[PDB]
């Protein structure tokens, strides 16, 4: 049904779904919009991001509850945790599939390239949160590789206080701390990111000020937690 809808209609319906807090619908509309094969604007990338983040966010929260109950411990909690986990992996695979088939390209601006590579890092990180096999090692390497490529571009092409560069650095620091068991790297990255961002904050455009300062606050909050 999405294939037969016009791109403009899919974007409009994604915005309606957002207002209704119907994030699964919103994600489905944005998936349809991506599949029209045209680039996404900054605004449209935000819609795509919010939709899937909310979907996977609910699944991650549920997984954590069930995993906690399971570890305190019949087969029921294991089975149900596995069910939720499989659904979460399905959503991650869908997003990574879209990134690979449609969104990640050699061309287009640095901002969009960094954004999509960051997102690839994020959804491999969510897969890593529930991974246990030898697949775990591979998943972690995929996350790291995506983040690192994004970092290299952002350092070459983007100011230090750019919101996407900052958001990438924040999430890579979380990867280091929570996934890769590298607290030293997590803290060093977060501290360097914060200082370099603050040093150039006076050059940042006013339209990005709110977003960038929010990320910088989270860098600080994490640093306090980690030290």
């Amino acid at each position: 049904a999405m294939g037969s809808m016009e791109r403009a209609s899919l974007i409009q319906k994604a915005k309606l779904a957002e207002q209704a807090e119907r994030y699964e619908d919103m994600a489905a509309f944005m998936k349809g919009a991506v599949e029209k094969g045209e680039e996404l604007s900054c605004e449209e990338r935000n819609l795509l991001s919010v939709a899937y983040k909310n979907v996977v966010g609910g699944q991650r929260a549920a997984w954590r509850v069930l995993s906690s109950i399971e570890q305190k411990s019949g087969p029921e909690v294991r089975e149900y945790r596995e069910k939720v986990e499989t659904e979460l992996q399905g959503v991650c695979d869908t997003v990574l599939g879209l990134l690979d088939s449609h969104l990640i390209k050699e061309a287009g601006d640095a901002e969009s390239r960094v954004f999509y590579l960051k997102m690839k890092g994020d959804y491999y990180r969510y897969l890593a949160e529930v991974a246990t096999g030898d697949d775990k090692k591979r998943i972690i390497d995929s996350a790291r590789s995506a983040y690192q490529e994004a970092m290299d571009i952002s350092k070459k092409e983007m100011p230090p206080t750019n919101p996407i560069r900052l958001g990438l650095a924040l999430n890579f620091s979380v990867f280091h701390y929570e996934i890769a068991n590298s607290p030293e790297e997590a803290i060093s990255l977060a501290k360097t990111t914060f200082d370099e961002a603050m040093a150039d904050l006076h050059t940042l455009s006013e339209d990005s000020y709110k977003d960038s300062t929010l990320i910088m606050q989270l860098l600080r909050d994490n640093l306090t937690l980690w030290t």
């Binding site: 935000n46 991001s49 919010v50 983040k53 909310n54 994020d122 919101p163 958001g167 924040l170 999430n171 620091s173 979380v174 701390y177 929570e178 977003d211 929010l214 990320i215 989270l218 909050d221 994490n222 937690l225 980690w226």
Partner: peptide
């Protein structure tokens, strides 16, 4: 606490 990642803007 868990570490904080980038939120929805």
């Amino acid at each position: 606490d868990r570490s904080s990642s980038a939120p929805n803007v």
